[PDB]
Design an enzyme around this catalytic site. Structure first.
Site, mmCIF file in Angstrom:
data_model
loop_
_atom_site.group_PDB
_atom_site.id
_atom_site.type_symbol
_atom_site.label_atom_id
_atom_site.label_comp_id
_atom_site.label_asym_id
_atom_site.label_seq_id
_atom_site.Cartn_x
_atom_site.Cartn_y
_atom_site.Cartn_z
ATOM 1 N N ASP A 171 0.310 17.188 -15.115
ATOM 2 C CA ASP A 171 -0.865 16.945 -14.690
ATOM 3 C C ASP A 171 -1.137 17.176 -13.083
ATOM 4 O O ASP A 171 -2.212 17.501 -12.533
ATOM 5 C CB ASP A 171 -1.697 15.794 -15.186
ATOM 6 C CG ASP A 171 -0.820 14.559 -14.741
ATOM 7 O OD1 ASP A 171 0.061 14.274 -14.153
ATOM 8 O OD2 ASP A 171 -1.426 13.306 -15.066
ATOM 9 N N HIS A 172 -0.076 17.095 -12.276
ATOM 10 C CA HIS A 172 -0.291 16.686 -10.796
ATOM 11 C C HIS A 172 0.045 18.155 -10.099
ATOM 12 O O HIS A 172 -0.396 17.810 -8.844
ATOM 13 C CB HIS A 172 0.714 15.654 -9.989
ATOM 14 C CG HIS A 172 0.294 14.281 -10.464
ATOM 15 N ND1 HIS A 172 -0.180 13.457 -11.400
ATOM 16 C CD2 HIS A 172 0.051 13.364 -9.444
ATOM 17 C CE1 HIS A 172 -0.649 12.439 -10.936
ATOM 18 N NE2 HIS A 172 -0.595 12.374 -9.806
ATOM 19 N N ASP A 177 2.624 5.373 -12.609
ATOM 20 C CA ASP A 177 1.271 5.795 -11.755
ATOM 21 C C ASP A 177 0.459 4.446 -11.904
ATOM 22 O O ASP A 177 0.298 3.578 -12.806
ATOM 23 C CB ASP A 177 0.524 6.740 -12.806
ATOM 24 C CG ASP A 177 -0.437 7.500 -12.162
ATOM 25 O OD1 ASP A 177 -0.293 8.341 -11.594
ATOM 26 O OD2 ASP A 177 -1.683 6.995 -12.195
ATOM 27 N N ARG A 237 -10.293 6.883 -4.905
ATOM 28 C CA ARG A 237 -9.548 6.640 -3.562
ATOM 29 C C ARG A 237 -10.036 7.575 -2.536
ATOM 30 O O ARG A 237 -10.544 8.770 -3.000
ATOM 31 C CB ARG A 237 -8.152 6.686 -3.689
ATOM 32 C CG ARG A 237 -7.443 5.636 -4.124
ATOM 33 C CD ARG A 237 -5.970 5.824 -4.559
ATOM 34 N NE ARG A 237 -5.402 4.841 -5.183
ATOM 35 C CZ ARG A 237 -4.391 4.897 -5.918
ATOM 36 N NH1 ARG A 237 -3.654 5.886 -6.358
ATOM 37 N NH2 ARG A 237 -3.910 3.803 -6.824
ATOM 38 N N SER A 293 -0.834 4.180 -4.428
ATOM 39 C CA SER A 293 -0.283 4.722 -5.547
ATOM 40 C C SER A 293 1.021 4.015 -5.367
ATOM 41 O O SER A 293 1.787 3.665 -4.462
ATOM 42 C CB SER A 293 -0.029 6.378 -4.935
ATOM 43 O OG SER A 293 1.193 6.936 -5.262
ATOM 44 N N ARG A 345 4.158 5.585 -6.182
ATOM 45 C CA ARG A 345 5.108 6.456 -5.960
ATOM 46 C C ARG A 345 6.292 5.878 -4.856
ATOM 47 O O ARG A 345 6.336 5.351 -3.827
ATOM 48 C CB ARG A 345 4.553 7.830 -4.720
ATOM 49 C CG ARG A 345 4.135 7.402 -3.387
ATOM 50 C CD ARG A 345 3.344 8.424 -2.570
ATOM 51 N NE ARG A 345 2.078 8.787 -3.552
ATOM 52 C CZ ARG A 345 0.947 9.143 -2.750
ATOM 53 N NH1 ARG A 345 1.144 9.399 -1.342
ATOM 54 N NH2 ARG A 345 -0.094 9.447 -3.322
HETATM 55 O O1 LIG Z 1 2.028 9.867 -6.111
HETATM 56 C C1 LIG Z 1 1.871 9.646 -7.384
HETATM 57 O O2 LIG Z 1 2.239 10.660 -7.909
HETATM 58 C C2 LIG Z 1 1.538 8.643 -8.252
HETATM 59 C C3 LIG Z 1 0.124 8.290 -8.002
HETATM 60 C C4 LIG Z 1 -0.820 9.238 -7.917
HETATM 61 O O3 LIG Z 1 -1.424 9.650 -9.342
HETATM 62 C C5 LIG Z 1 -2.100 8.924 -6.826
HETATM 63 O O4 LIG Z 1 -3.341 8.890 -7.194
HETATM 64 O O5 LIG Z 1 -1.886 8.768 -5.700
HETATM 65 N N1 LIG Z 1 -0.333 6.885 -8.174
HETATM 66 O O6 LIG Z 1 -1.263 6.315 -8.187
HETATM 67 O O7 LIG Z 1 0.498 6.008 -8.834
HETATM 68 S S1 SF4 Z 2 -5.918 8.828 -9.418
HETATM 69 FE FE1 SF4 Z 2 -3.607 9.715 -9.575
HETATM 70 S S2 SF4 Z 2 -3.594 10.167 -12.076
HETATM 71 FE FE2 SF4 Z 2 -5.739 9.877 -11.569
HETATM 72 S S3 SF4 Z 2 -6.510 11.947 -11.310
HETATM 73 FE FE3 SF4 Z 2 -5.912 11.165 -9.374
HETATM 74 S S4 SF4 Z 2 -4.076 11.786 -8.670
HETATM 75 FE FE4 SF4 Z 2 -4.272 12.177 -11.133
#
Ligand SMILES: O=C(O)C[C@@H]([C@@H](O)C(=O)O)[N+](=O)[O-]
Ligand code: SF4
Length: 753
Positions: free
Chosen positions: A99-100, A164, A446, A641, A643
């Protein structure tokens, strides 16, 4: 007991509510007190319920998760670490969700086709590693990870971990779903107990019922303004109260999801009839029926103690919009126009974006369409640009079928692929220049600096999908949908009616196209190929074991001022291209963090050459020349996140320790996992004693012990030394990760060689 499968894809994996009951009862015989719901599900999954020490906020619990879920930006490094372990197969049900890596540019099908060409190397790697190790694979286009999980995998009482930080979304179906770094998922896929610091429990009592324009998103936008982004750290948020039955199941998932922005370990709601209805509509009536028989274990005990209690009257709650650069700057929509005006935030909205895991449900698309059909009835279309991400293929097929997608297209919207897209900066945005000051409003979660379009001057405000639709129609933050008038085509002024929509399709969901790929659980004779010249994928070389010595005369790479999120430490957007390649992604290390010396991002003094330059380049120069370095940080370092790249990158470029006033949980765990030392000031005022020019000696690593502080000698250039104490939360398991060089190095030592 009952033989009810965990999902439609694993007909043989049965739900173990009997195990859960069994364990809850061992623990309550030990504790002799009412248990909250999160305590029932978490302690019900203890590896050793009889002997585990249980003190909220103090002991580390050894848990047995039911399943593991990964998305393609974190699965690559979790699977490269799993491939280093040498283990042949994952021990619990595991999935990868793609999905990313689908960039928003042209919309829907064209963006998906392009991502499939561009990202072929990575998707191939994940599908092949998935077939070989027995991991299910949801192909690009399937949907965002958390919407596929709610629809297929989450159920009451599950303990699910996902790589995640928005995995808490699954709390909308009464499960405990926790975000972790890739190395923690390796533990569970490897079959070894997962450890988690025992959470405090914050209770949020919901009273009244949602009415009108107020939606589930406003509940968590208000809780975030109350608790702030660090107020839930180390706690599970447990929602309860008569107001709960007023919220749909995807509405509860929305509230649990964004509990991530207050740093909570996860959030959960009690099993109730809205969840039952959602399980039946998603083909899991047998699981709702079984959960009805085990209902006592799926709601809190009468009289359980919350460490903090917050009460929110849903009936008095008003629409909110939070930001611009933090999700806890909360404003009522009725006041944002004037605060913006006063603060110098741009009032025209350039783009309105609905989507993300937080707000991409069938109901969210129906409530947006209900605002939009009214505008259309008066001959209006969006003044701002407008994008719409469906959460999954099932939602895309069903909103198409039920007519919502065409309404959203007719008001001027572009439907994007079922993917994160603009939410992690996967957006080819060209309407603004970089550094141009502008406002976008999203239904995301965010709004950190430069995260949506890599422009640090984009002011992003997060709100509900129906308020994004209303503000996109007006095109200005100075517009309150509750009180103000639009002017139709015909010349008449009209007011928007509060949106009303079905929470679930009246007919059944249309599943859309086939996107799941089951592992051959036969064959598995896949060779996973990673080309040695690949720029996207790189096999890991183990980190160095600790040398047995203290760390003296450490260079400060950077003393950071203020907010420092994992998006400031390891940016996303264009850097997602390198999430399977450690050396290439290390070129973004700390480029967004603000240096206290000059108040600049990506400009630090190289101690040897005395030139100011990029942080990654300076860290690589220090590493080249054998200069061991440290980062000094402020409060809630590593917010955001999960990560693990934010911890792997300082380790790789020669960093040794990160000393801060406080850490966000997942980042602190990732730092320990990779053999770095996360340490906090025993007196936070000591941050002001350390100057970028000082050298530091961390001493006492030889008798490193749980609960014992380390001493730090600050060596000032003029010869003056000062000694301060630094605290850590290592237990003896984690000190072994540090002595071995990483948790993965320790795991491999235990494989008898
Ligand atoms: O950096 C990532 O891939 C994981 C991440 C991402 O989905 C995000 O919203 O920043 N997260 O929130 O955990
Ligand atoms: S918050 Fe992280 S998992 Fe959710 S839609 Fe955004 S990038 Fe994708």
């Amino acid at each position: 007991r009952a033989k009810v499968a965990m999902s439609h894809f694993e007909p043989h994996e049965y739900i173990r509510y009997d195990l859960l009951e069994k364990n809850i009862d061992i623990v309550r015989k030990r504790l002799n007190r009412p248990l909250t719901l999160s305590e029932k599900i978490v302690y019900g999954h203890l590896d050793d319920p009889a002997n585990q020490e249980i003190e909220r906020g103090k002991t580390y619990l050894r848990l047995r998760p039911d399943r593991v879920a990964m998305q393609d930006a974190t699965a690559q490094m979790a699977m490269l670490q799993f491939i280093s372990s040498g283990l042949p197969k994952v021990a619990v049900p595991s999935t990868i969700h793609c999905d990313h890596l689908i960039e928003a540019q042209l919309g829907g099908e064209k963006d998906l086709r392009r991502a499939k060409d561009i990202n072929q190397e990575v998707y191939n790697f994940l599908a092949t590693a998935g077939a070989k190790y027995g991991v299910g694979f949801w192909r690009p286009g399937s949907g965002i990870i958390h919407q596929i999980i709610l629809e297929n995998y989450a159920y009451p009482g599950v303990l699910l971990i996902g790589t995640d930080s928005h995995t808490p979304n699954g709390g909308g179906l009464g499960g405990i779903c926790i975000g972790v770094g890739g190395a923690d998922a390796v533990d569970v896929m490897a079959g070894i107990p997962w450890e988690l610091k025992c959470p405090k429990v914050i209770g949020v009592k919901l009273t009244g019922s949602l009415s009108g324009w107020t939606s589930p998103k406003d509940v968590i936008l208000k809780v975030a303004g109350i608790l702030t982004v660090k107020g839930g750290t180390g706690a599970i948020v447990e929602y309860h109260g008569p107001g709960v039955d007023s919220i749909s199941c995807t509405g509860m998932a929305t509230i649990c999801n964004m509990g991530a922005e207050i740093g909570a370990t996860t959030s959960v709601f009690p099993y109730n009839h809205r969840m039952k209805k959602y399980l039946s509509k998603t083909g899991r009536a047998d699981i709702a029926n079984l959960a009805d028989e085990f209902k006592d274990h799926l709601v809190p005990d009468s009289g359980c103690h919350y460490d903090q209690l917050i009460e929110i009257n849903l009936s008095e709650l008003k629409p909110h919009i939070n930001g611009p650069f933090t999700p806890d700057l909360a404003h009522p929509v009725a006041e944002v126009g004037s605060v913006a005006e006063k603060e110098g935030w741009p009032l025209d909205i350039r783009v309105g974006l609905i989507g993300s895991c937080t707000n991409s449900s069938y109901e969210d698309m129906g409530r947006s369409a209900a605002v939009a059909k009214q505008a259309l009835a008066h001959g209006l279309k969006c003044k701002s640009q407008f994008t719409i991400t469906p959460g999954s293929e099932q939602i895309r097929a069903t909103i198409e079928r039920d007519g919502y997608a065409q309404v959203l297209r007719d008001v001027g919207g572009i439907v994007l692929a079922n993917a994160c897209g603009p939410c992690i900066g996967q957006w080819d945005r060209k309407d603004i220049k970089k550094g141009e000051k502008n406002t976008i409003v999203t239904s995301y979660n965010r709004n950190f600096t430069g995260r949506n379009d890599a422009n640090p001057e984009t002011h992003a405000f997060v709100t509900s999908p129906e308020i994004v639709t209303a503000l996109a129609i007006a095109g200005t933050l100075k517009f309150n949908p509750e009180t103000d008038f639009l002017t139709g085509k015909d010349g008449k002024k009209f007011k928007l009616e509060a949106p009303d929509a079905d929470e679930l399709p009246r007919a059944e969901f249309d599943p859309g196209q086939d996107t799941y790929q089951h592992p051959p659980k036969d064959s598995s004779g896949q060779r996973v190929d990673v080309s040695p010249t690949s720029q996207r994928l790189q096999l890991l070389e183990p980190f160095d074991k600790w040398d047995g010595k203290d760390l003296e005369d450490l260079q400060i790479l950077i003393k950071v001022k203020g907010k420092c999120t994992t998006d400031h430490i390891s940016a996303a957007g264009p850097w997602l291209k390198f999430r399977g390649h450690l050396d290439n992604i290390s070129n973004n290390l700390l480029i967004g963090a603000i240096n206290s010396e000059n108040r600049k991002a990506n400009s630090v003094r190289n101690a040897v050459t005395q030139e100011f330059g990029p942080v990654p380049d300076t860290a690589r120069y220090y590493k080249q020349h054998g200069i061991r370095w440290v980062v000094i940080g402020d409060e809630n370092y590593g917010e955001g996140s999960s990560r693990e790249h934010s911890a792997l990158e300082p380790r790789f470029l020669g960093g040794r320790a990160i000393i801060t006033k406080s850490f966000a949980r997942i980042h602190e765990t990732n730092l320990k996992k990779q053999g770095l030392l996360p340490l906090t000031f025993a007196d936070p005022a000591d941050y002001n004693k350390i100057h970028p020019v000082d050298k530091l000696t961390i001493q006492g690593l030889k008798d490193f012990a749980p609960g014992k502080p380390l001493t730090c000698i600050i060596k000032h250039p003029n010869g003056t030394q000062e000694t301060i104490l630094l605290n850590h939360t290592f237990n003896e398991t984690q000190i072994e990760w540090f002595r071995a060089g990483s948790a993965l190095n320790r795991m491999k030592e235990l494989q008898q060689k």
